[PDB]
Symmetry: none
Subunit: 280 residues, 2 copies
């Protein structure tokens, strides 16, 4: 009734201009065709940076999830409200967007005020949506927090992620949402499960941990072709989550299921080859 | 000036309803992206049966080849003229379509009158197009004749293929096309090269043999992943051709080149996996 079936998914669409050979396009189509993307109520996207592939993606899933938001921190247009340190003069956007099966009553973007090197030359932040499903109001916040970056002063990734999450949980309190409506928060939060920092994220976001299902890492270089190419001998991390603010209505038993769907490789175009014909 | 750069290609898109795990969709995208499909004047498609992937395909290539025909035998609409034993009560269409860089001044479909089992519960036949390039008229007939079928009475494959081709070469005589304009005929003709039947096809289609380049088979179980899956220990055939009616202008030196391009195919959606969230 009021509990949704969300999907978050960092989709690793880097600016096709600086990073040209990653089929950002080809993969946005692949996503549209996947099973996992079907039959949900709201989807949160992350690292959806590239304007083109951004569109390609949001477009594909427009049929089923008609109600969408801009991509966080791209422009001030199309948003009901724009708060925090939004900059026009920065390199990339927040790469966060929310699509939805049911009507979006309100959409608001928020650019984090704090930001560590390389990642702060962008409008990383969070997107808030009030959605109306079956007469009741529900709330979804998508975000993609500070990434672990080499540039960053040792320990800054965490100190800043903390500021950034406090920015979120603060936005929720001040938003005055009635205690009997659910508020979801989720996306690539860049904090590995079962670490010191995880305990902090729970407090800073003001959420409770949830129940997990399926795969036990979301960034897994070992079982995951693209992760593997980038960091061959790297340790898998569980970075993507969907929580619910603890001070508002809790869904019946909230689960996060990591889904490991992979596109079927086609190694040839057809069982036949093509004929070219010309006059030499 | 009047001679074209064609591509025919049987694309093995069976009805996604009876044959669902063949990425007919995923493959129609892959084709749009290939190299071989670029920089031609006319492309002929075959076994383009499924309505959905049919569209996906015809859509991808619309940019470069705007002028298209419907898929042979699907419906009577969109066709300037509809001759032969077209039926409405058959299972599948002819799966033949022609797209083109230059305008299509006339498009006509023809359903073969003869048909051998399994393959005859369908509107297999040929598509004719008059196309206008640089002021001159040129003519392209795509077709996909009777397939070698187990059901078929021993020897009927061939006897019907022959009727069907005579139906084409007859359509060409009675079409009153000017001897000084070229008439191309091509597609999976289901006739292996260097066999007895091959000599017949040349007479029945009223064409001359051409010069060959590149790979020497078009259906090759051994180098082609899909062929291999279906007929592991099967012998490679040359089945796809593009000839020109011998009683009309001949191109300067016609060549069929079998193109052995192979899609480099991505394996994961992102470096991250998707999170599904729900309340169980
Ligand atoms: Cl910007």
């Amino acid at each position: 009734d009021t509990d949704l079936k969300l999907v978050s998914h960092n989709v690793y669409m880097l600016s096709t201009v600086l990073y040209p050979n990653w089929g950002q396009y080809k993969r946005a189509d692949l996503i549209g065709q996947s099973s996992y993307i079907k039959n949900n109520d709201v989807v949160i996207f992350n690292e959806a940076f590239d304007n083109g592939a951004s569109d390609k993606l949001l477009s594909n899933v427009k049929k089923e999830y008609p109600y969408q938001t801009p991509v966080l921190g791209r422009s001030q247009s199309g948003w009901d409200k724009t708060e925090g340190s939004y900059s026009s003069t920065v390199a990339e956007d927040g790469g966060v967007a929310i699509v939805s099966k049911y009507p979006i009553k309100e959409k608001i973007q928020h650019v984090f005020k704090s930001g560590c090197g390389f990642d702060n030359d962008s409008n990383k932040g969070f997107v808030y949506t009030k959605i109306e499903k079956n007469g009741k109001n529900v709330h979804v916040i998508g975000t993609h927090t500070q990434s672990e970056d080499s540039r960053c002063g040792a320990g800054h990734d965490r100190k800043i992620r903390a500021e950034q999450m406090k920015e979120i949980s603060d936005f929720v309190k001040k938003k005055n949402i009635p205690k009997d409506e659910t508020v979801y928060i989720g996306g690539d939060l860049n904090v590995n499960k079962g670490t010191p920092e995880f305990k902090d994220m729970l407090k800073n976001l003001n959420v409770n941990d949830v129940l997990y299902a399926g795969h036990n890492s979301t960034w897994d270089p070992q079982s995951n072709s693209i992760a593997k190419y980038n960091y061959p001998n790297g340790k898998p991390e569980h970075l993507d989550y969907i929580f619910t603010d603890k001070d508002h209505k809790q869904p019946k038993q909230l689960v996060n299921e990591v889904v490991t769907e992979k596109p079927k490789p086609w190694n040839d175009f057809s069982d036949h080859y093509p004929i070219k014909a010309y006059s030499k």
